[PDB]
Paper text:
Bruton’s tyrosine kinase ([name]) is a central kinase in B-cell receptor (BCR) signaling that is expressed in the B-cell lineage and in myeloid cells. Loss-of-function mutations in [name] are found in humans with X-linked agammaglobulinemia (XLA). Here, we demonstrated that an unsuspected allosteric interaction between the [name] [name] and KD is critical for kinase activation thereby explaining the loss-of-function phenotype of a subset of XLA mutations in the [name] domain. Repebodies are engineered non-antibody scaffold proteins composed of leucine-rich repeat (LRR) modules that can be engineered to bind targets with high specificity.
In order to demonstrate the importance of the proposed allosteric interaction of the [name] [name] domain with the kinase domain in regulating [name] activity, we developed a repebody binder. The affinity of [name] to the [name] [name] domain is ~15 nM with a binding stoichiometry of 1:1. In contrast, [name] showed no binding to the [name] domains from its close relatives, the tyrosine kinases Abl and Lck, demonstrating a >500-fold selectivity for the [name] [name] domain. Even in the presence of a 20-fold molar excess of [name], no competition with pY-peptide binding was observed, indicating that [name] has a different binding epitope on the [name] domain. Consistent with the ITC and pY binding assays, the [name]-[name] crystal structure indicates that [name] binds to [name] domain in a 1:1 interaction and the interaction does not involve the pY-binding groove. [name] binds to multiple residues from the [name] domain BC loop (K322, S323, G325 and P327) and the C-terminus of the α-helix B (S366 and K374), and it buries a surface area of 2274 Å2. To further corroborate the [name] interaction site, a recombinant [name] containing the XLA mutation K374N in the interface between the [name]-[name] showed a ~9-fold decreased affinity compared to the wild-type [name] domain. Superimposition of the [name] [name]-[name] structure with a representative [name]-KD structure (MD model C15) revealed dramatic steric clashes of the KD and [name]. The coincidental strong overlap of the [name] binding epitope with the proposed [name] [name]-kinase interface led us to hypothesize that [name] may abrogate the [name]-KD interaction and thereby act as an allosteric [name] antagonist. In line with our hypothesis, SAXS-based reconstructions of [name]-[name] complexes suggests that the conformation of [name]-KD is altered and the interdomain interface is disrupted.
Residue numbers in the entry:
A (entry chain B): 9 to 266
B (entry chain A): 276 to 379
Write the structure that this text describes.
Amino acid sequence: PIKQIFPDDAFAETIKANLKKKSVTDAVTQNELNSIDQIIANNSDIKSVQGIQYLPNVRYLALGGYKLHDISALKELTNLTYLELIYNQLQSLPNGVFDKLTNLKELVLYWNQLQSLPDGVFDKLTNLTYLYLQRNQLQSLPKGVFDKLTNLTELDLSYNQLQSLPEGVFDKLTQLKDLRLYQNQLKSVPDGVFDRLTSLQYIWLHDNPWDCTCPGIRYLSEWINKHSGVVRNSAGSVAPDSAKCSGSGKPVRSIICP
Amino acid sequence: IEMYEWYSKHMTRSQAEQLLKQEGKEGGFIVRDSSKAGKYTVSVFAKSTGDPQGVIRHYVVCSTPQSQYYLAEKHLFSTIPELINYHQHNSAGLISRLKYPVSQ
């Protein structure tokens, strides 16, 4: 077939360049499609990736573009190890969209419009090591949403609209080194939420409207004091006091609860 | 320092950017001698800043008086290969983890 496998004309052009082919109209064989190892398209006019299920051996997909809105065909790409979908209009993820990507190591989902995550969306991704969900519109996380990501080392949740964290949400991320929660609307965190992060080197907690009422603020306050070398500011420098009370502006770790 | 794919001693800043942008990969990077005297610079390509076309950031490697090297403070290394290996595994406050060595 003459590359009418790919209905989106921007994606077809992308396939054209990938395979170095002559034109949109040029013909392609499945043997050519199988040789496609990585697809990159930055700042594209792609809207649908509808042809992509016929490239069964791609391992690196980077699609960024303001108009991308349909990614259901990605579910079939069994062998992805790097997946980047950024700057698009996606407000949700299709259910089970990642369920076959058991080799995915990195998942880059920043600068989109995601308001929620499907329950169990990441459960099959046991090899995932890096997860970037910053700059979206998330207000909540499903319970246990990271529980299978036991090899996770970096998790970026910054620049969202998070109202709360689920209890136990980070309990299984014992290899996590980097956790970014800055720039959200968190007034509190569940007690003990960080205590199993035995590998944590960097945590970003600033630009949240922390409620420093006692005794609720006690856990966060004692944790920051105990782990003050880990708390990083906007400029990536070490600053324990960057977590501030929404009313007083005091540093969270300066609140002492009788 | 050589033998490492991510090192290009003569590469200028302009050469770095064209090749980084031609690569287009998030976390593409090139380690090159700085314009300065006795300084190293790490050029990283990343798309996490608000521009989907991607931007190039040039990170000059810092030096303590004690002759250790750092890009991210508190993470002092005695050797540029040691510095780079860490930043290949940890975003460590940079625009991106060093994900992909770009060369030629």
